[PDB]
Amino acid sequence: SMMDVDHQIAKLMVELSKSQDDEIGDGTTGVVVLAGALLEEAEQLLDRGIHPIRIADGYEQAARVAIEHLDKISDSV
Amino acid sequence: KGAYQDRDKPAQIRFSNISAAKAVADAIRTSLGPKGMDKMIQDGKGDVTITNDGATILKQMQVLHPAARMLVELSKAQDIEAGDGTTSVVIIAGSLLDSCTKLLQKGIHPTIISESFQKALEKGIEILTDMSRPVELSDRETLLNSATTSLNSKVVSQYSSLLSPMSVNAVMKVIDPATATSVDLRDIKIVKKLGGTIDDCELVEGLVLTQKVSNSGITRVEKAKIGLIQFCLSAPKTDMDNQIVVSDYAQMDRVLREERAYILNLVKQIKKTGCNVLLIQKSILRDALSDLALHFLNKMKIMVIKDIEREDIEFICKTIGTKPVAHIDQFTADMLGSAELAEEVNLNGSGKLLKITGCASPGKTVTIVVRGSNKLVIEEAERSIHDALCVIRCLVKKRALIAGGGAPEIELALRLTEYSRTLSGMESYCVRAFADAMEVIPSTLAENAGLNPISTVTELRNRHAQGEKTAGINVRKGGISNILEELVVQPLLVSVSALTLATETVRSILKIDDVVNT
Amino acid sequence: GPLSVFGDRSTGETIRSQNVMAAASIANIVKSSLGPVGLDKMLVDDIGDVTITNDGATILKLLEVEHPAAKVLCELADLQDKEVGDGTTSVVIIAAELLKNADELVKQKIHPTSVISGYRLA
Amino acid sequence: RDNKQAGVFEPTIVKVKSLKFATEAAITILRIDDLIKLHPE
Ligand SMILES: Nc1ncnc2c1ncn2[C@@H]1O[C@H](COP(=O)(O)OP(=O)(O)O)[C@@H](O)[C@H]1O
Ligand SMILES: Nc1ncnc2c1ncn2[C@@H]1O[C@H](COP(=O)(O)OP(=O)(O)O)[C@@H](O)[C@H]1O
Ligand SMILES: [Mg+2]
Ligand SMILES: [Mg+2]
Ligand SMILES: [Mg+2]
Numbered sequence: 001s002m003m004d005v006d007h008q009i010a011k012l013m014v015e016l017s018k019s020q021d022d023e024i025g026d027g028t029t030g031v032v033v034l035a036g037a038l039l040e041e042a043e044q045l046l047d048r049g050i051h052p053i054r055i056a057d058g059y060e061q062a063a064r065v066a067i068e069h070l071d072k073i074s075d076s077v
Numbered sequence: 078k079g080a081y082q083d084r085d086k087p088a089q090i091r092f093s094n095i096s097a098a099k100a101v102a103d104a105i106r107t108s109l110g111p112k113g114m115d116k117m118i119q120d121g122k123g124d125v126t127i128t129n130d131g132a133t134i135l136k137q138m139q140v141l142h143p144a145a146r147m148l149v150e151l152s153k154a155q156d157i158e159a160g161d162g163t164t165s166v167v168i169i170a171g172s173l174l175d176s177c178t179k180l181l182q183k184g185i186h187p188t189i190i191s192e193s194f195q196k197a198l199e200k201g202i203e204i205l206t207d208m209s210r211p212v213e214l215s216d217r218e219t220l221l222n223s224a225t226t227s228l229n230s231k232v233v234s235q236y237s238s239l240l241s242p243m244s245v246n247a248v249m250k251v252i253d254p255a256t257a258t259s260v261d262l263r264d265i266k267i268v269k270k271l272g273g274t275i276d277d278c279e280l281v282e283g284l285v286l287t288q289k290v291s292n293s294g295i296t297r298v299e300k301a302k303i304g305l306i307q308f309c310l311s312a313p314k315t316d317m318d319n320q321i322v323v324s325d326y327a328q329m330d331r332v333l334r335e336e337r338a339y340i341l342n343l344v345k346q347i348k349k350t351g352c353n354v355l356l357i358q359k360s361i362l363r364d365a366l367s368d369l370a371l372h373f374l375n376k377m378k379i380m381v382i383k384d385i386e387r388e389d390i391e392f393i394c395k396t397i398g399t400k401p402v403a404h405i406d407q408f409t410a411d412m413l414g415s416a417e418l419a420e421e422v423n424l425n426g427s428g429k430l431l432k433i434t435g436c437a438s439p440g441k442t443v444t445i446v447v448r449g450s451n452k453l454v455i456e457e458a459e460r461s462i463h464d465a466l467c468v469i470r471c472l473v474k475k476r477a478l479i480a481g482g483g484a485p486e487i488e489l490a491l492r493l494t495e496y497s498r499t500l501s502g503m504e505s506y507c508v509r510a511f512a513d514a515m516e517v518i519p520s521t522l523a524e525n526a527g528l529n530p531i532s533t534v535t536e537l538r539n540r541h542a543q544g545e546k547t548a549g550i551n552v553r554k555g556g557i558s559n560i561l562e563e564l565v566v567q568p569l570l571v572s573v574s575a576l577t578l579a580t581e582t583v584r585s586i587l588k589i590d591d592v593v594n595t
Numbered sequence: 596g597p598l599s600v601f602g603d604r605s606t607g608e609t610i611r612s613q614n615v616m617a618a619a620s621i622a623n624i625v626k627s628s629l630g631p632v633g634l635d636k637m638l639v640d641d642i643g644d645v646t647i648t649n650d651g652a653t654i655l656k657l658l659e660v661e662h663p664a665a666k667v668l669c670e671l672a673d674l675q676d677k678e679v680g681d682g683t684t685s686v687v688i689i690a691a692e693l694l695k696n697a698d699e700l701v702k703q704k705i706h707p708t709s710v711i712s713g714y715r716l717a
Numbered sequence: 718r719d720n721k722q723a724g725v726f727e728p729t730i731v732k733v734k735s736l737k738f739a740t741e742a743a744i745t746i747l748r749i750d751d752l753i754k755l756h757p758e
Binding site for chain 4: 600601602603604605606607610611613614618664667668671674675678679681682685686689690693694697698701707710711714715
């Protein structure tokens with residue numbers, strides 16, 4: 001938020017962190033690191049020629065799998 | 078907790094170099110393969126250049142980043158050593174660096190990456206040599222197929238049927254196939270003349286000159302005796318300061334007359350040898366061909382071509398058996414060259430050429446006349462013909478042949494993945510990176526062909542694992558096949574040199590940690 | 596951005612459309628001077644020097660062309676004039692129309708190599 | 718109209734060379750998929 005960004009994708013990342021803070025109040029740095037990592041991997045996938053929408057759909061599939069796995073390995077306090 | 082690494086500029090510099098290199102690789106990825114297209118480059122001066130050659134493209138685009146400059150030098154080195162592969166080498170280098178990115182991120186040291194890359198390079202040279210098959214220079218079909226493969230990528234590929242046999246004849250005419258270990262492409266002269274079409278390119282066994290004939294009326298000579306003249310046919314002139322002081326009117330008439338007589342004696346000593354074609358070297362500091370000399374030569378029925386350059390002399394002698402004469406005393410019949418014809422041929426109002434065809438001593442020299450409708454297409458035809466000649470030169474150097482269509486890259490990728498699984502450690506990650514990085518050339522071939530790169534490369538990997546090591550991307554069928562049936566072959570030297578030079582350039586760039594502005 | 600070349604870069608359909616536009620410009624200059632019903636053109640050389648002509652090679656020589664893909668067609672007219680002496684307008688018109696239709700195919704994603712093979716065969 | 722009887726004739730070389738040169742030009746221009754225009758100095 002304090003960062004004087006001009007790039008619109010960086011503005012989207014600022015919005016991402018702000019959203020994590022609004023909903024949760026923690027994770028505001030994890031969300032950004034993870035999104036950057038996902039895009040960095042999509043970079044190689046696009047180099048290999050996959051459609052960015054196919055990449056996004058594979059990401060949705062894997063995200064659903066990871067969310068259910070979190071519900072699975074979770075503990076209660 | 079080891080050493081904090083208080084400095085981040087080395088890593089920033091590494092990433093900047095990798096980014097620049099990958100940018101160059103990704104910029105020229107489209108000029109790779111038979112389905113690859115050309116780039117137009119307008120220089121700052123406005124000199125236009127259409128080309129498919131990686132070395133040409135990189136040299137012509139005034140790259141500014143240091144790593145990109147180094148890739149330019151890499152492509153030039155590949156052009157020297159093999160003359161073919163100047164795009165594959167840059168793409169391989171860019172890909173190796175783009176993989177070094179994630180390796181560095183994992184936290185591997187550039188020195189470990191460099192050593193593991195050297196290991197992968199040695200194993201890959203082994204693998205490519207195992208894939209290779211020997212070749213006999215007598216295998217004219219193999220030579221034709223190598224040349225056709227080299228030309229498939231260029232604008233002159235519909236003319237491959239014409240320019241591959243010429244590219245094989247030229248080299249096979251300028252080398253002793255039994256003893257030759259290399260070839261000097263300066264033995265092959267290329268003459269770009271506008272006009273006609275690329276289907277008009279020709280292989281002249283004799284000599285071709287752009288210099289004009291000085292005689293009017295004598296354009297054609299049969300049973301031609303040719304002499305090279307490194308002395309001047311004009312009034313005598315000592316190398317020292319010389320004057321002719323006249324003090325009486327008679328000495329004037331005497332001066333004119335004695336000059337006439339000097340010139341006439343010269344041209345008579347020339348005629349007496351049987352010479353009917355006269356090549357005069359270019360002469361500054363003195364008139365090499367005075368009007369009197371031209372008059373006398375024409376009256377004696379001698380064709381005269383002056384302004385021959387002092388750098389074409391060794392070529393002209395090698396070609397038409399002439400011996401250069403620098404003193405009239407040594408101008409005799411044994412210092413001439415016998416040619417069955419010497420003619421000034423016209424090219425459909427698009428200029429004139431002096432063709433000395435037929436030779437009693439045609440010594441290991443040939444000329445290729447490149448025709449064309451545009452300056453750009455002529456220049457690119459010349460470059461492509463040079464690539465074909467250089468492929469034949471690689472075949473002469475190393476009598477070994479490798480399949481094409483990304484078959485060596487896929488086999489390399491596969492066997493180095495296996496090697497990586499066997500060399501467990503932190504070198505395993507780097508060798509696996511080397512393998513997946515070289516797996517990018519097939520991906521490029523597929524993308525440019527118009528296929529699904531992932532599916533195509535997966536099918537290629539699968540068939541090479543099954544055992545079809547001569548399997549590649551058939552842009553004619555649209556998928557995978559045995560590439561030798563499409564006759565896509567290239568010298569082992571090309572792939573080997575590309576790998577070696579790319580690995581060395583990558584290690585050099587990995588040993589860099591700072592940039593200064595001197 | 597990543598590529599540090601000190602210049603501009605056109606890529607893909609952008610540069611293909613530009614090349615076709617340039618060729619079309621050159622051909623539309625001369626289309627009106629074709630056949631027994633074609634008409635002549637004035638050309639003024641920035642000083643009041645006047646030139647009347649119907650010869651396409653003359654027109655394209657006198658013009659000051661900036662695009663290289665259009666310089667190609669100008670040189671084509673010059674070459675036709677050198678080797679034949681007639682057809683300098685028809686050759687430019689035909690080259691431009693071939694370029695137009697071939698770029699239409701390349702937009703339909705027929706590979707330019709395939710378009711070129713077909714053109715050579717035809 | 719029957720142009721052979723009307724007298725509208727052209728040397729074969731005109732049409733032949735027109736076709737060949739136009740094809741060469743079209744191929745050369747179509748081979749271009751990129752353009753790098755360097756800023757003058
Ligand atoms: N007909 C073909 N089918 C499949 N691959 C081909 C064919 N012709 C050439 N290649 C491949 O294209 C690559 C070289 O193309 P080119 O654009 O000339 O790049 P380079 O400058 O690296 O030689 C090589 O991998 C070669 O095997
Ligand atoms: N009398 C005519 N009737 C119909 N068409 C004609 C006649 N004379 C010439 N043409 C056509 O005009 C076209 C072009 O003529 P012109 O513009 O004068 O020369 P070019 O285009 O060859 O430079 C040719 O296709 C030719 O067949
Ligand atoms: Mg926290
Ligand atoms: Mg090649
Ligand atoms: Mg006409």
